[PDB]
């Protein structure tokens, strides 16, 4: 049919079988780059705004303010434009001019914080703006807002169930906010009732999930896998539903993304390479060689044309 604005067209992304990964086609990828603003975050940008409207914490008067240097900023931007909200985003000077030209193009009130301060500097300034007029500003908080995993439970998960005819055995997904793996796992394990293996993927350079579950010292670090590796356990990561954690290094993630392009003709971002590299590893263990493995590919290549990818 016909969507009443762009936010309602989220999802229904396709499953594509890989030929040069896995074993005899047991690895399939879900291309989340085919979304209204071309990442998985389109789903949570839409539903966090929808939920805040249904809750009344977001009205025609109110203005969105958030701290995000990634795909969630673009997602909130396209949704705020599609639905008539003013929006302010904060971020460090670190950001590529193209990501800033994109956000200004979408009409964001960009507020730039100190580069050396980083992500914490951005979230600090956003909270001060929200302190100015709490009745005027709404922060949606992707790391904590349950509307984030809820939309994956209502769309991403069921799409995977339907398109595989219940045959999905494994879901592999990088963890940023954690909403994707949390929502998908809850839908397939709890609503459809199938005991799959939920595999979280994190950078080996910042393996805080592996370290936490192992009761080891939590040592966050810098990495190049944009979209994952927050360096902490997000509230929207439901640890209780995670069966397995795979770590991937930045160079392997980048090499795997280039292989997806050159060998599969799939234009995937760098966190897409990390998730596929973790999936290939499981898929070549005899214990998974007959299982159907579904891998989330969060974003598209051209988000990364001027980065280490090319």
């Amino acid at each position: 049919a016909i969507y009443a604005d762009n936010s309602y067209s989220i999802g229904n992304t396709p499953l594509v079988r890989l030929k040069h990964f896995g074993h005899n086609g047991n690895v399939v990828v879900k291309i989340e780059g085919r979304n209204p603003s071309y990442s998985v975050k389109c789903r949570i940008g839409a539903n966090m705004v929808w939920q805040a409207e249904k809750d009344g914490t977001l009205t025609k008067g109110k203005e969105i303010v958030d701290a995000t240097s990634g795909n969630t900023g673009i997602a909130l931007a396209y949704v705020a434009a599609a639905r008539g909200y003013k929006i302010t985003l904060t971020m460090p000077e670190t950001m590529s001019l193209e990501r800033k030209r994109l956000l200004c193009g979408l009409g964001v009130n960009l507020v730039l914080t100190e580069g050396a301060k980083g992500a914490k500097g951005a979230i600090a300034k956003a909270e001060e703006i929200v302190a100015s007029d709490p009745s005027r500003y709404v922060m949606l908080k992707q790391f904590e807002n349950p509307a984030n995993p809820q939309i994956h439970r209502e769309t991403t998960g069921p799409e995977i169930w339907k398109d595989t005819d219940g045959k999905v055995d494994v879901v592999v997904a990088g963890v940023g906010t954690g909403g994707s793996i949390t929502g998908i796992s809850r839908a397939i394990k709890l609503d459809f009732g199938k005991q799959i293996t939920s595999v979280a993927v994190e950078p080996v350079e910042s393996p805080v999930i592996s370290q936490t579950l192992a009761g080891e010292e939590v040592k966050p670090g810098p990495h190049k896998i944009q979209g994952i590796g927050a360096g902490f356990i997000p509230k929207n990561l439901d640890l209780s539903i995670i069966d397995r954690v795979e770590t991937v290094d930045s160079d392997t993630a980048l090499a795997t993304a280039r292989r997806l392009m050159a060998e599969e003709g799939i234009l995937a971002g760098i966190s897409s390479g990390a998730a596929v590299a973790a999936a290939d590893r499981l898929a070549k263990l005899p214990e998974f060689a007959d299982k159907l493995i579904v891998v989330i590919l969060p974003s598209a290549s051209e988000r990364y044309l001027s980065t280490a990818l090319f």
Partner: peptide, 8 residues
């Protein structure tokens, strides 16, 4: 390069 929720 990304840390502390940056890039998400």
């Amino acid at each position: 390069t990304f840390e502390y929720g940056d890039g998400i």
